[PDB]
């Protein structure tokens, strides 16, 4: 989820 | 044409959390391949090109609840130099094969830094304004790679 658009933190 | 499975969808959006505009931009994504948070894909399903609407997406269908286990207590020595290890600062750790893992600094005390690996929006309900700019069919290479070419933010 953390990689999903529109707001991607990364992981 | 309408948003649906295996379509490449271009949206313009504004993202607000508790009345503060946090983000605003335009992106293209391949629909139905877990490329976009589920509550937003659900709101977009079946929408026509040219539709514009506002949607509330609870944390559960956005970036998920805040996971308490994503908060760690690490040594200040792991931070380089003497950088700006203050609350709100963002750093990247790397795992054994070099994958970068982003964190936000929460607190510093002694030789210990409390850090948060959660997504910054974990636990937040998200308010969007969304405009469907374009919908098209995906190419074979897009459905093979699982993502639009190019994907992500125009702006
Ligand atoms: Cl994509
Ligand atoms: Ni790997
Ligand atoms: Ni317009």
Residue numbers in the entry:
A (entry chain B): 5 to 15
B (entry chain A): 1 to 155
Tell me what the authors wrote about this structure, in their words.
The original S2 peptide sequence (NH2-TRYWNPKMKPFIFGA-COOH) was modified such that the first proline residue was changed to alanine (P6A), a leucine residue was placed upstream of the second proline residue (K9L) and the isoleucine residue was mutated to alanine (I12A), resulting in the pseudo-wild-type (psWT) peptide:NH2-TRYWNAKMLPFAFGA-COOH. Although most of the protein–peptide complexes did not crystallize or yielded crystals of poor diffraction quality, we succeeded in structure determination for four complexes of SlyDWT with bound substrates: psWT, W4A, W4K, and M8A. In all structures, the peptide substrates are bound in the PPIase binding pocket with the proline residue in cis conformation, coordinated by the previously observed protein–peptide polar interactions, namely N35-L9, I37-L9, Y63-F11, H119-F11 and Y92-F13. Although all peptide substrates bound to both SlyDWT domains in solution, the chaperone domains displayed no electron density for peptide substrates psWT and M8A in their respective crystal structures. The absence of these substrates in the high-affinity chaperone domains can be attributed to high dynamics of substrate binding and serendipitous blocking of the binding site by neighbouring molecule of SlyD in the crystal packing. Finally, the residue W4 of psWT peptide could not be resolved, indicating flexibility of the peptide N-terminus. Finally, the loose conformation is defined by the newly determined structures with the substrate bound only in the FKBP domain. In these structures, the access to the FKBP binding site is not restricted and the peptides bound in the FKBP domain can freely diffuse from the binding site upon its release.
